[PDB]
Design a protein around this ligand. Structure first.
Ligand code: SF4
Ligand code: SF4
Ligand code: SF3
Ligand code: SF3
Ligand code: F3S
Ligand code: F3S
Ligand SMILES: [Cl-]
Ligand SMILES: [Cl-]
Ligand SMILES: [Cl-]
Ligand SMILES: [Cl-]
Ligand SMILES: [Cl-]
Ligand SMILES: [Cl-]
Ligand SMILES: [Mg+2]
Ligand SMILES: [Mg+2]
Lengths: 581, 264, 581, 264
């Protein structure tokens, strides 16, 4: 065994090894291993992406106009965000400016995704880490109603409703076919909600499962379908016609009315169901404001998103702020430049890829994706891994760093950056949330805080949906209908050689696509995705990524039952297909 | 009465097919899971992880040997001895073969499981391979699309439960009910195609009147699916209705049939 | 002034004359006049239909296969029922038998209409006679929640919800733009609900206004659209294809899944919102179990409906019983024959029509529709009716009688017929309902009883939707897909001369269409519609119809404010376009 | 902020147009009434009756003279001195003229108000006459159909509220947005029409595949409406999708253009 120090942690791989493979209630394929000491405290953590497809390779030689459709299929959970980054990158390369309505519609598509993705994550992915579903069978329906009504104005709170939900669960488990609940961690000492809060949360899980299907109708209006809506380089394909013949063949007043209806319903659900449930989880699990801090009190990163001024990606335009903090210096939010070769770099010394020099990082315009499955001296064999060897290569995920620093990305990171840049709405929102919990601001830098920030962002995005919708309607009232710029649609109009960067904030964090075009074809296409940051393996200096850091020092009540590991990993909302692409 | 056991596994994928399933409007996915089937294994949704999840897998495929339906999303890679997709420290293909052996029938959800989809597009770095090229001794129902329509997925499930049989299929293993006709055989812009009324550039006057997308690369003429009839997201739209040509996403090899913007 | 005796009533047109024109919250155009005595009790009542279109005349010369489409436009509230009666009449004339799935789908269409029509009547038409909407502004939201939760398991009951509803109403009223609530009867002493019940009822009014749009999606699936779905002679046009190529072009599993979803939601809404609300109206308005009896303790009529055996309209087939009671003799339910010239006859001595002899009644196969506007002396002019002359002609509605008897039709009539034929489900439901209200059975024969019966029927129909759906699915599982018979589609196959009767129970009561075909065209088409019975004018013997009888003997608190008149008339659910056609 | 006053009157009618209006899915009719307009007079929905109702009518048309929108459902009959439709003891045509005189603009809902509809079909016993033949000095927007599509009704209302203007209209006064193209120009069965693939008798093999309804009398080729694109009842269906040809119900005189089952 070995021990070394990095980032304030003592990484020690002596002692008992625990393996969690598969990690469930994530998107895609992940393995996690830890070592625990005699005190059941994690002293080493290992993050492994267990899938790879090779989109960066597949994109070579394709028409740049097609790229969005391929990269959209990086992920069906964060569906659309890779298309958006792609069109941004190709437009940056070629020098295309889109019309204002296309920008506004793209912002609507992104905000819709934030709302949908965050909602489903909270309930379907992370929820059962916090809510003991079987304990809901012991609740009193009247006390459940009283609790729900004390937390929210949401209408669906009658004792009869909660009794009906409880009886549905009773029937479900009566035949002994427990389905997704089978062999869960129910009764674990870290489940702290009272029975009535478990029943409330389970009711809401079911309400969210039904409701989420509505949100994405906005994607269907503008983008044809969800999952995986359609886009174009130059704008959007959803031509608008409000008051002319043939409006039945376009985005018309009836289609816009549908969008408005969905926006209102989405805001209402997020504000009155998800927000109070997040706060309730906080109230009953305050010790988790001190667990899973990881890198969130050290190094955080946001590129920024939602340009309000069309084709302007600067600080004055982006509604979701960008910036980086390192060394725990939140007084110094630093600007990020995605073209600077000294800023974003990926390392592969601990990943399954070949570089000419694996001891150095490569900026994505110099990126290389040459897969090399070489797990080395594992316990087991290369097709039957019992334990990965984290001293060697152990993941399909590359290791991104920012100026050589390991960073956390995602809702908590964005919230910290916006708060410390002095965004008024963010400061007010965070302050009021922490005051409601009687927790210090540092309590947000934690597993609990990641969940709280994610719920807050869903509320933020639902509000922004209305803002963007109203901006679109203002344009239409002024006779501004344009949705595509086509003067550089044809390849003969493009530079013979050019390159571009497309960036945004996906639900899970900072996303970038770097593209080079030569002679009308994709010459290079490199993606660095939010879960690539968070789930990163180690670098040549032994620096650990956000997941490995957040797991360090965590106490486990029952080593064989990885509830605490799942809680912290799920708080980051891992998307493994994203991470590996 | 007991519900039919279903085991849902995931290979190389983007999870679009699981996402599509949970969009179902009628029946709601909630009601499919609670009342129609017993969804007994599914990494995306299940409470258990790690050793506890793999105990579920083993217990279900053993207790219900010969009696469960296997749903497959994604596909197995043959490259790197299968270790482009690792499940419990072993190649995914080993899990697929173990799950298939006990299944009464297999549902290949989406273009990934049916044909290969994006990871199988040139140059296919991982040697991603559709399910019917690996499993050759079980009935396989192909339900293609990237992803398939939510209410098509749920209708196929309700068909099977209600009628207690697999749907009738075409020569490619696709359900005739939803895949028997081409997009272009039921497209509401077909009046325009037949009149030579085409969008020639994005957001032109033709586009604003809903003219045909053929000259913009629409692959509807060669694509079998239900999008132009059933539509998407509870009838709200489909690609063409929102102004983009069909990509051909339900067809084998659609990614490598030329640019999406080249005419069929 | 004059007085005479009929049906146990003393009809006396001395005293003050009150006019209500227009009657609102009905379908179509009605005028009512009454006389009141010195104790403000009604001693004379005059029912007048104030519109006529002439569909019976327009239908002459049409192709019988087209007739359903014309007559469907008799009424957009009871939309579909006239189409059903038409296809039945034409099939009866020609000798067409439809396939079982067509009959099942027609029964689904009719049950859907019962659900939809009864729900909208309860809330949007009648509800404001019972709920003082402006008094809802004085309610305590917590007490509203408690009340709602004591009545029902319905989820939507939180204090916050009721506060939000109340605040929406406050904001609506605050600028003086009271809309549909302007100059209402609010504060009338006959409004007996406490403020919390008024707020509950108003909230449910809004929920029903939203929800009703869903119910008719069943008509859209099978019939293309609602209002005014499509039908065919020979079955239905909605071809079924479950498992063959091209199912995308037909009623397929996805379409059937949609129908099932709607059925479930419809039953939930009716059982947990409308039913408890109806019972609550009963509990707080018990004196109305003794008001508005009218003909309901004397003479009631049903033709019956919902044939369960395809093409069999006999007693063993009809799920909704037919029969007639006269002279208060409920121990002898009499059979009805729509071909018998001595049974149904229409009189026009008090209506605006010409017969060769207006002192005799005409069976509909001998019917005549020759309009003759002739109001006589009306204290104004022919274009300014100040006071109808009820000694002479006073309505566009013909006067139907059964064996010379004036009859009540509709939900209360049907309930009484079924009860006294010994329908087990009806006996049990009625007895349990009257017990729960602590009222005698005779309390059902009243204005309150009409309302309670209608709500019961909505519940019955919602249950029958599932029964019919299940029957359809059974046929499909057995490989029986047929939806149309076309053996006699072509006119060359028809008899040169034939006649037929189509009958059913519309939401408002007994409906018949009598059709005679000659040489491939309609020679005669006569309709007798439920509101024609109930809103009937007088006959040559001076016998009064159901509305006039029910208004007789009623006390008015405030003569100038006709709330009691509105309550009783609305309890019959008047459809004036139906009545006059 | 005050909402625009609306007066809704009813002539000879079946009430299908009111019923359609309340079916609106987006915006809900509830939200139209509570938030977008002030529906200040409407016999079918209002609390007041008789003299109380007529006091509302008179007050609104006087207070808001020149500023209210008049919605008209149904039509006036000229026969029997107008007394085939009696309103407060007088001919409906008098109420129509009084309401029209103060309106800023008029919405003629449905085929009744637009054209005449069923009561105007041969031999037109009451001399039912559309609004534009009686009211000749006000802007009239025709919104035909029997009834018009619910979400078309509400879209026209939201257009006028949002944009503060009347929709642009064709030569007949119909909004271009929804009435500019034929049913047949946007029909999903057009591929079958173009291929000579027709239903020949009900429930034949062609009908079960969704073939074209032209030989069954479909009037889509001569009918202007939005049914084949926007569809009915929140996108659920339209006549043709459920297997019946278009009757032509948005067109002037459709009842008298031959049998519904005779070919165009
Ligand atoms: S838009 Fe595509 S599918 Fe539709 S008619 Fe044109 S080419 Fe065919
Ligand atoms: S069904 Fe009617 S509208 Fe559609 S293509 Fe055929 S004729 Fe035209
Ligand atoms: Fe649908 S998992 Fe998403 S990529 Fe195309 S189907 Fe695969
Ligand atoms: Fe629509 S009221 Fe019904 S008949 Fe044709 S529109 Fe008129
Ligand atoms: S791209 Fe796919 S979703 Fe349908 S319209 Fe074409 S098959
Ligand atoms: S009958 Fe009418 S509803 Fe549409 S499809 Fe034809 S215009
Ligand atoms: Cl799996
Ligand atoms: Cl493929
Ligand atoms: Cl869908
Ligand atoms: Cl009126
Ligand atoms: Cl007409
Ligand atoms: Cl609609
Ligand atoms: Mg990459
Ligand atoms: Mg008649």
């Amino acid at each position: 065994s070995t021990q070394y120090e990095t980032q304030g942690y003592t990484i020690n791989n002596a002692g008992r090894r625990l393996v969690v493979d598969p990690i469930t209630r994530i998107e895609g394929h992940m393995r996690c291993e830890v070592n625990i000491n005699d005190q059941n405290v994690i002293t080493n953590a290992v993050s492994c992406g267990t899938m790879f497809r090779g989109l960066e390779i597949i994109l070579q030689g394709r028409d740049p106009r097609d790229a969005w459709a391929f990269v959209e299929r990086i992920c069906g959970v964060c569906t659309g965000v890779h298309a958006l980054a792609s069109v941004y990158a190709i437009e940056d390369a070629i020098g295309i400016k889109v019309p204002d309505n296309a920008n506004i519609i793209r912002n609507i598509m992104l905000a819709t995704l934030w709302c949908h993705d965050h909602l489903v994550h909270f309930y379907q992915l992370a929820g059962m880490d916090w809510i003991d579903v079987l304990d809901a069978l012991k609740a009193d329906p009247r006390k459940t109603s009283e609790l729900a009504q004390s937390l929210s104005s949401w209408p669906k709170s009658s004792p009869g409703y909660f009794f009906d939900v409880q009886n549905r669960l009773k029937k479900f488990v009566e035949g002994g076919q427990l389905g997704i609940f089978r062999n869960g961690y129910w009764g674990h000492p870290q489940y702290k909600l009272p029975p009535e809060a478990n029943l409330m949360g389970f009711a809401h899980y079911l309400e969210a499962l039904d409701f989420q299907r509505e949100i994405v109708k906005i994607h269907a209006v503008f983008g044809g379908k969800n999952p995986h809506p359609n886009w174009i380089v130059g704008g959007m394909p959803c031509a608008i016609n409000i008051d002319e013949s043939g409006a039945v063949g376009a985005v018309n007043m009836e289609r816009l009315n549908l969008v408005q209806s969905i926006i209102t319903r989405t805001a209402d659900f997020i504000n009155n169901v998800m927000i109070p449930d997040a706060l309730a989880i906080g109230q009953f699990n305050k010790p988790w404001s001190e667990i899973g801090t990881g890198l969130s009190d050290k190094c955080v990163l946001s590129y920024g998103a939602f340009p309000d001024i069309a084709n302007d990606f600067g600080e004055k335009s982006l509604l979701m702020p960008g910036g980086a903090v390192i060394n725990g210096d939140f007084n110094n939010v630093l600007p990020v430049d995605l073209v600077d070769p000294q800023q974003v770099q990926e390392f592969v010394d601990h990943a399954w890829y070949r570089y000419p020099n694996d001891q150095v990082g490569r900026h994505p315009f110099d990126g290389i994706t040459d897969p090399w499955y070489n797990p080395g001296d594992v316990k087991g064999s290369d097709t039957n891994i019992q334990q990965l060897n984290e001293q060697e290569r152990y993941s399909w995920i590359k290791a991104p760093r920012w100026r050589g620093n390991a960073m956390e990305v995602g809702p908590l990171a964005r919230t910290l950056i916006a708060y410390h840049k002095g965004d008024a709405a963010t400061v007010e929102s965070v302050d009021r949330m922490m005051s409601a919990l009687n927790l210090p601001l540092s309590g947000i830098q934690s597993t609990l805080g990641r969940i709280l920030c994610r719920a807050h962002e869903a509320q933020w995005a639902a509000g922004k949906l209305q803002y963007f919708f109203d901006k679109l309607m203002t344009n239409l009232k002024n006779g501004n209908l344009a949705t595509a710029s086509t003067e550089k649609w044809e390849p003969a109009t493009w530079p013979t050689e050019c390159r571009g960067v497309g960036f945004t904030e996906a639900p899970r964090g900072a996303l970038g696509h770097w593209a080079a075009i030569r002679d009308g074809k994709i010459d290079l296409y490199q993606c660095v995705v939010p879960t690539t940051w968070n789930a990163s393996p180690r670098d040549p200096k032994g620096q650990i990524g956000a997941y490995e850091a957040a797991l360090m020092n965590t106490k486990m009540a029952i080593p064989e039952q990885p509830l605490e590991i799942l809680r912290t990993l799920h708080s980051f909302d891992p998307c493994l297909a994203c991470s590996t692409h | 009465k007991p519900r039919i056991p279903v085991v849902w596994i995931h290979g190389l994928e983007c999870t679009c097919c699981t996402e599509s399933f949970i969009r179902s409007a009628h029946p709601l996915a909630k009601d499919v899971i609670l009342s129609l089937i017993s969804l007994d294994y599914d990494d995306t949704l299940m409470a258990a992880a790690g050793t506890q999840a793999e105990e579920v897998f083993e217990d279900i495929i053993t207790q219900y040997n010969g009696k469960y339906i296997l749903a497959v999303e994604g596909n197995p890679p043959l490259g790197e001895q299968g270790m482009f997709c690792i499940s419990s420290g072993r190649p995914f293909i080993e899990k697929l073969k173990r799950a298939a052996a006990g299944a009464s029938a297999i549902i290949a959800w989406g273009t990934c499981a049916s044909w290969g989809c994006v990871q199988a597009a040139r140059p296919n770095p991982t040697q991603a391979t559709p399910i019917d090229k690996v499993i050759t001794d079980k009935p396989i129902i192909k339900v293609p699309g990237c992803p398939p329509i939510p209410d098509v997925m749920s209708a196929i499930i309700t068909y099977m439960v209600t009628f207690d049989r697999l749907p009738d299929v075409d020569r490619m293993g696709r359900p005739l009910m939803f895949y028997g006709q081409r997009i272009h055989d039921k497209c509401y812009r077909r009046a325009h195609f037949d009149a030579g009324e085409f969008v020639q550039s994005w957001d032109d006057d033709a586009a604003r009147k809903g003219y045909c997308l053929y000259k913009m690369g629409c692959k509807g003429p060669t694509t079998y699916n239900a999008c132009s009839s059933t539509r998407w997201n509870d009838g709200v739209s489909f690609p063409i209705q929102s102004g983009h040509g069909c990509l051909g996403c339900a067809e084998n090899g659609f990614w490598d049939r030329g640019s999406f913007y080249s005419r069929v």
